[PDB]
Design a protein around this ligand. Structure first.
Ligand SMILES: *[C@@H]1O[C@H](CO)[C@@H](O[C@@H]2O[C@H](CO)[C@@H](O)[C@H](O)[C@@H]2O)[C@H](O)[C@H]1NC(C)=O
Ligand SMILES: *[C@@H]1O[C@H](CO)[C@@H](O[C@@H]2O[C@H](CO)[C@@H](O)[C@H](O)[C@@H]2O)[C@H](O)[C@H]1NC(C)=O
Ligand SMILES: *[C@@H]1O[C@H](CO)[C@@H](O[C@@H]2O[C@H](CO)[C@@H](O)[C@H](O)[C@@H]2O)[C@H](O)[C@H]1NC(C)=O
Ligand SMILES: *[C@@H]1O[C@H](CO)[C@@H](O[C@@H]2O[C@H](CO)[C@@H](O)[C@H](O)[C@@H]2O)[C@H](O)[C@H]1NC(C)=O
Ligand SMILES: *[C@@H]1O[C@H](CO)[C@@H](O[C@@H]2O[C@H](CO)[C@@H](O)[C@H](O)[C@@H]2O)[C@H](O)[C@H]1NC(C)=O
Ligand SMILES: *[C@@H]1O[C@H](CO)[C@@H](O)[C@H](O)[C@H]1NC(C)=O
Ligand SMILES: *[C@@H]1O[C@H](CO)[C@@H](O)[C@H](O)[C@H]1NC(C)=O
Ligand SMILES: *[C@@H]1O[C@H](CO)[C@@H](O)[C@H](O)[C@H]1NC(C)=O
Ligand SMILES: *[C@@H]1O[C@H](CO)[C@@H](O)[C@H](O)[C@H]1NC(C)=O
Ligand SMILES: *[C@@H]1O[C@H](CO)[C@@H](O)[C@H](O)[C@H]1NC(C)=O
Ligand SMILES: *[C@@H]1O[C@H](CO)[C@@H](O)[C@H](O)[C@H]1NC(C)=O
Ligand SMILES: *[C@@H]1O[C@H](CO)[C@@H](O)[C@H](O)[C@H]1NC(C)=O
Ligand SMILES: *[C@@H]1O[C@H](CO)[C@@H](O)[C@H](O)[C@H]1NC(C)=O
Ligand SMILES: *[C@@H]1O[C@H](CO)[C@@H](O)[C@H](O)[C@H]1NC(C)=O
Ligand SMILES: *[C@@H]1O[C@H](CO)[C@@H](O)[C@H](O)[C@H]1NC(C)=O
Lengths: 177, 343, 338, 182, 48, 48
């Protein structure tokens, strides 16, 4: 770009004009070129800052999803996070998140607690689920029905505050033996 | 490379007038004209250029012959058909290899098509050409480049354009070029394999903005659209304030030159039409301004010196003059910025 | 947290040379010192689009809330969209929209009333005079409310499941018991003090509306972003009133008053001044866009953590042991309810 | 000549745009008009003593939405931020600076909140976005036999949960999905 | 981890035209170019 | 002189660099030539 001078090429303008009139045009060239360079360096600085932010995020993602398991949702891939393998890329990194996603689900029934004998029973882990006829306990992200024993539940209450409590019998392996 | 250049080109899918030949209207010349002609062997010799096509303005004649050319920038009188009748104020006779190249593969079916382009920016007449026996129906559809042949500095005025014929015992494809921005695709061997205009289609505007022949799916912001003003109004204050020019030129006792009455004209709008209609002038020479340019300049003060004088003394009255009036009665300073009026 | 700002798409050619052929020719000597600016501004606009999409488009399926609203005594009408309002917006979002006044909405098509302004033309018409325009956002401020409603429906009828896989329904009482279980308190406490905790939640949701209403400016961050953009734009427009060391400030005056080869110096001075002003404006826009992008990434992580699950990280989702959050849309921002 | 784009040279001030009647309260000495940002807004008529505002010409920006050129050559034009009845009369009177004239069949008119789309038609269906237009509108290339259509965003597939007092959906099975993050 | 940097309050007229009335007058011809700088420096101090 | 950095003044066009045989396809009307970003690259010998 001529930048408002005689020509845009120095090696021609220096020989086409003598110094005491060429210094003005060469100064115009200097100011234009250095302004362009200032624009370039500012844009490069901004791009480098953005890349640094992305690199810090990627470093945290490495040290979290690879060197351990992340409980954060939607951080190491969609769904529940299981593992992650890194892969090198040109001027970047690529992850392989392995995520646990549930599958076919069925309505059964639920009750906040079970009242066996005046006492409300609550599951130590999981919810109280009902086939429709027989109440059961299971895990949360997989259906594994189990018999309601004294081991699966901890008892605390008086069977008159829990709204939606449902009547059923609990079991124990100690009365039998 | 996909270099983009803005220069006066012929628009793509533009409108081209097609003529026949069995009398040779003078087609106007402005911003160049694209020329094409297909023929069996030859029916066309040359062209003539210029304005008024007579022995008053410089003209051009580029007739070819069997072996050379006859380019000349001369002031030919007339032919109305031994193609000129005047070579008085004429120079710059140009002779080179003949433009028309004709080749046939032992048959007349290989009718050569010839595309010629001419332009007159800052003089420097440019002639572009490419000769090839194309399919021969008419103007082809496949892209073809044009190689400049001569570039010669005519440095004259051209307005009208005309073509010459041959003797004997489907041509004239004429289009007008327009100033447009173009992009040209260059082969690795350097030849132009494709070109796209940048004022024809929205897709052309996009391809031009990114200078690429393949646009991926997406949106592209290309330019800005403007409703250009249709009419242009100029409105100024209602002030008229006519100058006392009327009373300086309707006076009945214009003082003598020895005692020249000097009127100071201030606080008025100096309209010169009241000056133009009041006196059938005989000497309205000006020195610092133009007789035409007076209504568009604003001044601080105006002096109107009025005196009746003889005939030769009118020519006497001028800056840097001498005489019995210019020395003893009224001397105009050499640095005078004004006008004199004599009727 | 702000998510985005208004998208400006200035055109240097006219902003610097108002419909002047000779000025455009003079600017043509400065190389590609315009395509860079336009590319930067369109990149900023696309960045804003991706910020808002990243903040809000976290769930694919747009769930709807069940017709009956009895979530174990929890009162959600203040955050649930109100069908009576024609915009389908929650009462809280109503206050958020009302308490923010945008100088430039953008989606106005204001051409046609600048002539009919009657009074002195406002900032928008003034900007439309000297080569300034605003590109309206892709995601209309209405559909954003629909995304917010879908996210709110997902977190009150299906727990945190819908952000992992299929949306599995769960009543709010035992969802409450589980959010309690994730902190260190057994579900028996919730099932014994459900009425008390529901009254606490209702009182808090009542008090937050009054706190937002009575404050002078608690939405000061979004107001600050809007004011910063408007002030930068107004200064950028005002810069055309500086002679920059030339005879006058008006291109059509200098061109019509002076000859070409002498007015060339003055028009070059005007180019060098106006274009430097535009460059400074573009750089400030770049910095603001980087900061807003960082805030939008933080907001997206906050959404996916606090709204879409329980966050163990202290103080991240509000002060105290975090339980949930509800998202609420705002002009050029989001409002969280930890 | 009011309500028309026109070059004006009022008493020495020169500009471009549209002038019409105004309801200022101009003081008798006042001659010019301006705003907060020092731009000439209203001009008093020197030969009529009435008040007229000054308007921009047509301000906006042309954007082109196109599919891949290797797929099709059809294109559509976006006139950003303009009521496109204004351009419709502008196209008719041929005072538009753009020289490329894309066809107007009446069905290719689109009063979008983000400007006007020309060369595309409404489809009241809802498809996932392909090319973002703005104001919740997306264009895409589709078979009728092929053309460019414009349609509103579909935020996703419509789904309704089955929340109840005692209803739980518990997954009886699971899957493993491997995504990618770059 | 750094938490803040030194706060700066550079001034337009005093930095550019040290006590020169003509220089300040010719700076005024540059419009409000530098009020932006003063506001930005106040901002950076505030964010520190 | 080829394969040697030399100050050249070909047809008044000044510069510095190394000259060597090239396999380009200059047209007879082509004189200077250039490269992608506007720098004189391949100047054909006016004599040979
Ligand atoms: C309740 O849950 C029971 C699981 O113990 C299911 O009972 C099964 O019934 C078959 C015969 O019907 C038995 O042979 C088997 O051992 C098991 O007990 C029962 O289907 C289920 N009820 C409903 C309505 O789902
Ligand atoms: C579960 O079974 C309890 C008895 O073991 C029921 O308690 C009864 O409640 C009725 C009133 O509803 C009393 O009249 C009676 O004396 C006894 O206390 C209890 O209601 C029952 N609950 C459900 C949900 O079935
Ligand atoms: C550029 O010019 C080269 C010199 O003729 C071409 O190379 C030739 O290609 C032909 C086949 O077309 C070979 O038979 C011959 O031996 C030589 O390699 C080259 O093709 C050409 N490139 C173009 C026109 O794109
Ligand atoms: C949930 O909370 C709403 C608060 O917005 C209650 O609405 C109230 O309705 C009464 C009139 O019935 C108004 O006077 C009051 O200002 C408020 O708008 C709503 O009733 C409440 N619902 C339940 C089930 O608690
Ligand atoms: C859980 O879902 C798996 C796939 O998502 C099932 O595996 C399938 O098993 C069938 C045969 O049963 C194969 O044909 C198929 O290729 C796939 O491996 C799996 O059976 C299922 N489990 C249950 C208990 O439903
Ligand atoms: C639960 O029941 C509702 C009742 O219509 C049904 O729509 C939903 O699909 C069921 N959920 C299942 C089967 O997972
Ligand atoms: C060429 O002329 C014909 C007939 O005069 C006209 O219809 C056509 O539009 C013209 N071409 C163009 C590109 O306008
Ligand atoms: C053709 O034109 C040239 C032009 O110099 C002339 O010398 C020659 O005699 C003409 N005739 C033939 C047959 O070449
Ligand atoms: C040469 O040109 C002059 C000026 O136009 C003209 O008067 C004169 O007649 C010309 N000579 C001719 C025609 O022989
Ligand atoms: C004087 O004015 C009258 C009235 O307009 C006009 O008819 C007449 O020609 C004028 N005479 C001179 C000498 O200006
Ligand atoms: C302007 O001058 C003309 C000429 O006499 C007159 O008819 C008109 O009333 C004037 N208008 C104003 C506003 O002065
Ligand atoms: C813009 O929209 C339509 C179409 O032109 C019309 O009502 C009028 O021109 C404008 N309306 C408003 C409210 O600006
Ligand atoms: C179909 O599209 C038209 C506009 O072309 C619209 O008015 C109408 O409401 C649409 N119908 C449906 C069912 O969306
Ligand atoms: C849940 O129970 C309440 C009262 O116990 C009742 O008003 C509501 O309709 C019930 N909802 C469902 C979905 O069963
Ligand atoms: C001198 O220049 C002419 C021009 O073609 C040609 O003979 C040759 O290039 C030169 N002669 C030499 C170098 O002996």
């Amino acid at each position: 770009s001529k930048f408002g001078a005689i020509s845009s090429v120095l090696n021609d303008i220096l020989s086409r004009l003598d110094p005491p009139e060429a210094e003005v045009q060469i100064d115009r060239l200097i100011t234009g070129r250095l302004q362009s360079l200032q624009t370039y360096v500012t844009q490069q600085l901004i791009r480098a800052a953005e890349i640094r932010a992305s690199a810090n995020l990627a470093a945290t993602k490495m040290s979290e999803c690879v060197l351990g398991q992340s409980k954060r949702v939607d951080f190491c891939g969609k769904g529940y996070h299981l593992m992650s393998f890194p892969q090198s890329a040109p001027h970047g990194v690529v992850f392989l998140h392995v995520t646990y996603v549930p599958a076919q689900e069925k309505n059964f029934t639920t009750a906040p607690a079970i009242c066996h004998d005046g006492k409300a029973h609550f599951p130590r882990e999981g919810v109280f689920v009902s086939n429709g006829t027989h109440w059961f306990v299971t895990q949360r992200n997989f259906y594994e029905p189990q018999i309601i024993t004294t081991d699966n539940t901890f008892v605390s209450g008086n069977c008159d505050v829990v709204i939606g409590i449902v009547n059923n019998t609990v079991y124990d392996p100690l009365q039998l033996e | 490379v996909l270099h983009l250049t803005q220069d006066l080109f012929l628009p793509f899918f533009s409108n081209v007038t097609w003529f026949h030949a069995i009398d040779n209207p003078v087609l106007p010349f402005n911003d160049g004209v694209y020329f094409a002609s297909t023929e069996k062997s030859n029916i066309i010799r040359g062209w003539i250029f210029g304005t008024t096509l007579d022995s008053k303005t410089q003209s051009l004649l580029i007739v070819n012959n069997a072996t050379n050319v006859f380019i000349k920038v001369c002031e030919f009188q007339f032919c109305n058909d031994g193609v000129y009748s005047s070579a008085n104020n004429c120079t710059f006779e140009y002779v080179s290899q003949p433009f028309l190249m004709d080749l046939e593969g032992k048959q007349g079916n290989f009718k050569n098509l010839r595309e010629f382009v001419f332009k007159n920016i800052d003089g420097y007449f440019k002639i572009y050409s490419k000769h090839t026996p194309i399919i021969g129906r008419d103007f082809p559809q496949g892209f073809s480049a044009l190689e400049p042949l001569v570039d010669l500095p005519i440095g004259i005025n051209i307005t009208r354009f005309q073509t010459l014929l041959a003797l004997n015992r489907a041509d004239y494809y004429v289009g007008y070029l327009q100033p447009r921005t173009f992009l040209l695709k260059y082969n690795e061997n350097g030849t132009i394999t494709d070109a796209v205009d940048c004022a024809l289609d929205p897709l052309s505007e996009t391809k031009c903005t990114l200078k690429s022949f393949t646009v991926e799916k997406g949106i592209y912001q290309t330019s800005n659209f403007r409703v250009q003003p249709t009419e242009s109004i100029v409105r100024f204050p209602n002030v008229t304030n006519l100058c006392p020019f009327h009373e300086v030129f309707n006076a009945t006792r214009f003082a003598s030159v020895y005692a020249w009455n000097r009127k100071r004209i201030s606080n008025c709008v100096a309209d010169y039409s009241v000056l133009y209609n009041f006196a059938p002038f005989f000497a309205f020479k000006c020195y610092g301004v133009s007789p035409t340019k007076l209504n568009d300049l604003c001044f601080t003060n105006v002096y109107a010196d009025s005196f009746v004088i003889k005939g030769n003394e009118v020519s006497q009255i001028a800056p840097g003059q001498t005489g019995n009036i210019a020395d003893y009665n009224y001397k105009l300073p050499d640095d005078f910025t004004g006008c004199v009026i004599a009727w | 947290l702000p998510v985005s700002m208004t998208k400006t798409s200035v055109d240097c050619t006219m902003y610097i040379c108002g419909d002047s052929t000779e000025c455009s020719n003079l600017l043509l000597q400065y190389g590609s010192f315009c395509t860079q600016l336009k590319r930067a501004l369109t990149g900023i606009a696309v960045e804003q689009d991706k910020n808002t999409q990243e903040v809000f488009a976290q769930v694919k399926q747009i769930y709807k809330t069940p017709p009956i609203k009895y979530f174990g005594g929890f009162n959600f009408s203040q955050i649930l969209p109100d069908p009576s309002k024609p915009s389908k917006r929650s009462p809280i979002e109503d206050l958020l929209f009302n308490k923010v006044t945008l100088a430039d909405a953008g989606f106005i098509k204001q051409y046609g009333d600048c002539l009919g302004d009657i009074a002195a033309r406002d900032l928008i018409c003034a900007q439309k005079f000297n080569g300034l325009t605003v590109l309206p956002p892709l995601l209309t401020d209405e559909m954003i409310a629909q995304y917010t409603s879908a996210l709110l429906a997902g977190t009150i009828t299906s727990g945190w499941t819908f952000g992992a896989g299929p949306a599995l329904q769960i009543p709010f009482p035992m969802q409450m018991a589980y959010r309690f279980n994730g902190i260190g308190v057994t579900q028996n406490v919730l099932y014994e003090n459900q009425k008390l905790i529901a009254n606490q939640f209702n009182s808090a949701i009542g008090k937050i509306q009054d706190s937002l209403f009575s404050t002078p400016s608690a939405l000061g961050k979004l107001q600050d972003v809007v004011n910063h953009n408007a002030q930068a734009l107004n200064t950028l427009v005002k810069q055309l009133s500086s002679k920059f060391g030339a005879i006058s400030s008006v291109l059509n005056d200098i061109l019509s008053r002076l000859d070409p080869p002498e007015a060339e110096v003055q028009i070059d001075r005007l180019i060098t001044g106006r274009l430097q002003s535009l460059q400074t404006y573009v750089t400030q826009q770049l910095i603001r866009a980087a900061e807003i992008r960082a805030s939008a990434n933080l907001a997206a992580t906050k959404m996916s953590e606090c709204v879409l699950g329980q966050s163990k990280r202290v103080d991240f989702c509000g002060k105290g042991y975090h339980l949930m959050s509800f998202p609420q849309s705002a002009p050029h921002g989001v409002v969280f309810l930890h | 000549v009011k309500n028309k784009c026109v070059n004006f040279n009022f008493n020495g001030l020169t500009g471009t745009g549209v002038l019409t009647k105004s309801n200022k309260k101009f003081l008798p000495f006042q001659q010019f008009g301006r705003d907060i940002v020092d731009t000439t807004d209203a001009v008093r008529d020197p030969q009529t003593l009435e008040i007229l505002d000054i308007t921009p010409c047509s301000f906006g920006g042309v954007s082109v939405i196109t599919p891949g050129t290797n797929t099709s050559n059809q294109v559509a034009v976006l006139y950003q931020g303009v009521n496109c009845t204004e351009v419709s009369v502008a196209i008719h009177a041929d005072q538009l600076t753009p020289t490329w004239r894309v066809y107007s069949t009446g069905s290719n008119v689109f009063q979008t909140r983000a400007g006007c789309l020309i060369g595309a038609e409404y489809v009241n269906n809802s498809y996932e976005c392909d090319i973002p237009i703005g104001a919740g509108i997306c264009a895409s290339y589709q078979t009728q036999s092929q053309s460019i259509i414009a349609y509103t965003m579909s935020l996703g597939a419509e789904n309704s949960v089955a929340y109840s007092n005692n209803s739980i959906a518990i997954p009886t099975n699971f899957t493993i999905s491997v995504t990618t993050e770059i």
